Design a protein around this ligand. Structure first.
Ligand SMILES: O=C(O)[C@H](Cc1ccccc1)Oc1ccc(-c2cccc3ccccc23)cc1
Lengths: 227, 244
């Protein structure tokens, strides 16, 4: 059918857009372990720099989603604006376990306790994403499921200020069918995977809103607006 | 298929419990909105907020009665019963509230009145924005064209969520929600054969549900201290105490 072609195309584009896949993360999870100060504001700013990296990679991945480049430009702008943060957290889950997260494209690993011990502002920076990551990682998704999931996420017709919702929901419809079939084929004995996955978007958005809540002139200019 | 039959029996039980638990259903509300209400559209007729607290508390009682009928719920560990009710009852209040709203206003007083959206937008201090997020949700949610038989399973699903903060025995809850989600899927396929992937879109609406409740929590924090003379009910106070 159409849905396996769509799923293979999306998987191939995910492999090509994202250097460090979930499979490689699971493989690792040897990295340099950062467990304390001997191994503040530098960690937070580094996370924002990695985030701008990732925004660029995600936008490139979005352009490969069939139909997306054809949409009205304002609607592509606002879909990426509100989608990239939820996708960043979805992809960050791939790099985490209960004890820490892999950083630096897989060569480092920083511990959850070292992150939890930072001074007042930065001590809760990461803790909601660890709490979420444990739940999301319990779904035991792999890369081919995530490739379709994040596309679904990008094609969300509820973002405020959308000009033309109809083609976007049409595409998300195709994607949703493709995802449902992908999860039936890959996870036979995972009874209601589709529904549980869609439920996870509620925690995704709650993370995003809480993180928005918590939040050199040329550098200031590069790393403003898209977080 | 033999399993679809079991899901049908579950759906029928849930629907029957819904009808028994909520005196004013979506069907009656729609019938009244299209036997006719008195309309309130300006002052000529703080008080409204206390009315909303009285109705909220009554809704909490009705939803607790419904919850007791969801198969398995009363057999759960009493602490998880308290946690699920604490985290689910407001999502359910806004869900059922959408049934009573259209673009222009909302039914009040057991259906005998209708208060206009603009009037509710014109209220003083930080009260003008009380109903707006609800009207904005209601317009999108009513667009799904759900009926009582769909809603009855949906709100059960909303109660039995295994990601609620602080649950002890997640396993029985995810088993119940798995069952309820199969039941809802079947019901929506049979009852709305032509609406494509309605199940996915309904499940996606839970996101806006949670955004409504967390924004209402903030607004509540801003409301209670401006007017130290205002009063909050212990039931709602205890539901909001911990939270997020
Ligand atoms: O959240 C809920 O339980 C309901 C939901 C709901 C929405 C619409 C119609 C019916 C019910 O909203 C409420 C919002 C406000 C107050 C309230 C009343 C009196 C004094 C207050 C002082 C500080 C804060 C809140 C106060 C009660 C319920």
């Amino acid at each position: 059918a159409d849905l396996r072609a769509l799923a293979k195309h999306l998987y191939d584009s995910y492999i090509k857009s994202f250097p460090l896949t979930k499979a490689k993360a699971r493989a690792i999870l040897s990295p340099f372990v950062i467990y304390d100060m001997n191994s503040a504001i530098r960690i937070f700013q580094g996370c924002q720099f990695r985030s701008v990296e990732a925004v660029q990679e995600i936008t490139e991945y979005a352009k490969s989603i069939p139909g997306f480049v054809n949409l009205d430009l304002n609607d592509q702008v606002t879909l990426l604006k509100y989608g990239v943060h939820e996708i960043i957290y979805t992809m960050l889950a791939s790099l985490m376990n209960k004890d820490g997260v892999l950083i630096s494209e897989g060569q480092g690993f920083m511990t959850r306790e070292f992150l939890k011990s930072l001074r007042k502002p930065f001590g809760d920076f990461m803790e909601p994403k660890f709490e979420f990551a444990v739940k999301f990682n319990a779904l035991e998704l792999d890369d081919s499921d995530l490739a379709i999931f994040i596309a679904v996420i990008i094609l969300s017709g509820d973002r405020p200020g959308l000009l033309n919702v109809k083609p976007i929901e049409d595409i998300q419809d195709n994607l949703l069918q493709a995802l449902e079939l992908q999860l039936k084929l890959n996870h036979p004995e995972s009874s209601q995977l589709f529904a549980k996955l869609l439920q996870k978007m509620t925690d995704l958005r709650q993370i995003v809103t809480e993180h928005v809540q918590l939040l050199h002139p040329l550098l200031q200019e590069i790393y403003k607006d898209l977080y």
